[PDB]
Design a protein around this ligand. Sequence first.
Ligand code: CA
Ligand code: CL
Length: 262
Amino acid sequence: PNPYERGPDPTEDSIEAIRGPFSVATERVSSFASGFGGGTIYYPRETDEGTFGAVAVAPGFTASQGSMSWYGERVASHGFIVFTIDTNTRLDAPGQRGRQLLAALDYLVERSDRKVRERLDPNRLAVMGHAMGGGGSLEATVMRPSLKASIPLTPWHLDKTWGQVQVPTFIIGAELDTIAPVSTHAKPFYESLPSSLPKAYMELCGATHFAPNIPNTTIAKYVISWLKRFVDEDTRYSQFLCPNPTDRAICEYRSTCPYKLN
Ligand SMILES: [Ca+2]
Ligand SMILES: [Cl-]
């Protein structure tokens, strides 16, 4: 069987609930931690099903972990260790945010608490970020091709070409984004991603550049699904991903469906 499957069989209500089947504890990471600006480790408390994978969540330009805080309980309650991080400075560039996503992942694996270490499978790590943090999520996978999943949310980056990414990438964009317009960022990024890569692109109808900062079930249900499918190799969630979702909130959805099991 799949030794990484956690929780009951998924239903579209289970991927949409604010609280998943797991109960979450936290650990404050002080900013004096080396390589990044600290953050908050949300982790599941039930250890009887085995350890979990982890995702590091990066904020945007001039932002902090508060803008990403809702992902903490929302995602970790479904079977993941969620690290909402701060950056070294509020003004760090997307390339810097990739290093600090990896620096936070090193901290989970190498330096975190026994509470967190004992619940962590250090082989299953993912990245996710907002805006310049999303460009850092793309930068992180170029720097660490062994990452399991990458979710750039309304991503912003100068470089448009990611033709050597090997990590399954899920780019979410905002229809009315004029800070990182999807015609020049999100869609070019997704298009230049390898056509053989497990990848999807979800555009939210009438959303702004700051929609990933407000709780959104359309984002959460398919962020949880994408992590389940690629961090847990849990094909029970392939149903919600392939074929493409038809949600009313979604204005456009491209993908390399189906995501055959590698
Ligand atoms: Ca630091
Ligand atoms: Cl602090």
